[PDB]
Amino acid sequence: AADLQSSFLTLLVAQLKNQDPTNPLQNNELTTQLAQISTVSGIEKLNTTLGAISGQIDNSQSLQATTLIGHGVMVPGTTILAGKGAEEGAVTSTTPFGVELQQPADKVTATITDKDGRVVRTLEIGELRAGVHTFTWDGKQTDGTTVPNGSYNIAITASNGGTQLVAQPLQFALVQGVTKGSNGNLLDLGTYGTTTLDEVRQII
Template identity: 50%
Template structure:
């Protein structure tokens, strides 16, 4: 005569909980096999005078289906994340050797050339004033708002011609750009952008990062506002 097991004992084992535990340590197939083994054992050893109710069996089946679905969803998300990482790496690699605008306020002048700079506005501005400032804080050149004109929200790029306010040529070196923007005499949030060249791509746990050299350092793809 087969030994009988009180169904309350197996019920207390909580098949759903056991399935969830298996989900954290095995594959979807292992999870299903573990659940079915527990369920068949419970059915074989249940008290024939008190068989498992249909609702109870349905509930336990629903639990395993839920855990199984979560397991499959996690696998899908892992696959999508891997594809996104691969796509970002390819995108980053395509930027090697390209010039980009990233948050920063530096402008470099050498001989008759200067690096571009940019303006990023959160909202439209009817007046934008740009000042080129030297290392000691002196204003070397003020670009008249009429020259800049009204700007829409977003990113705009500019080039300083390398001259001072008096028309003379500014010496070579590093300068800073200072930007003030208003709309109907109210200040508009603005971010200055500076030029950098992408020298390489560094792979990290958080995704690819662009190597912009010793001065600019490394930035993520989301820092790129414009490709020049």
């Protein structure tokens, strides 16, 4: 508040000490300046108070992150876990993936690759709309064979009449805790690391 008020007070003493003695300034505008400075000082403290509200909302969001502890979220990343449960006959399931598109794309190709780099399958369902579209891969080879359990990565390329689009890959990431680090309060995803709450696009 006084950061500008002290600086704006030098403008009063500069106008009072530097007025033409022949044609001085009417005091009618003097109260306008003081009213205008109070307007400026009022806005300045409004921003300061509102930033504290933003920080408090961030802290409340970090606290609310404990509600879905033990579940998983889709955040910017490419790591994919494929596997099956201990019960016999479990189909090899692939952890859900997703694509975030700034603009809708009429041709989106999503190719999944294993740890060895071998292409396991490419998905051609059609267009994918703008926003976050998430899918749960069936965990099957290109010929229908169940994928080996392990790590996978998806490359998603979108085209608009031959012109590409920049997209954000997202992967299911189970959160095992909420850790207050150097920047803010992030979500520990375990293997995927720690991530803040603002990049969380979709949860499961």
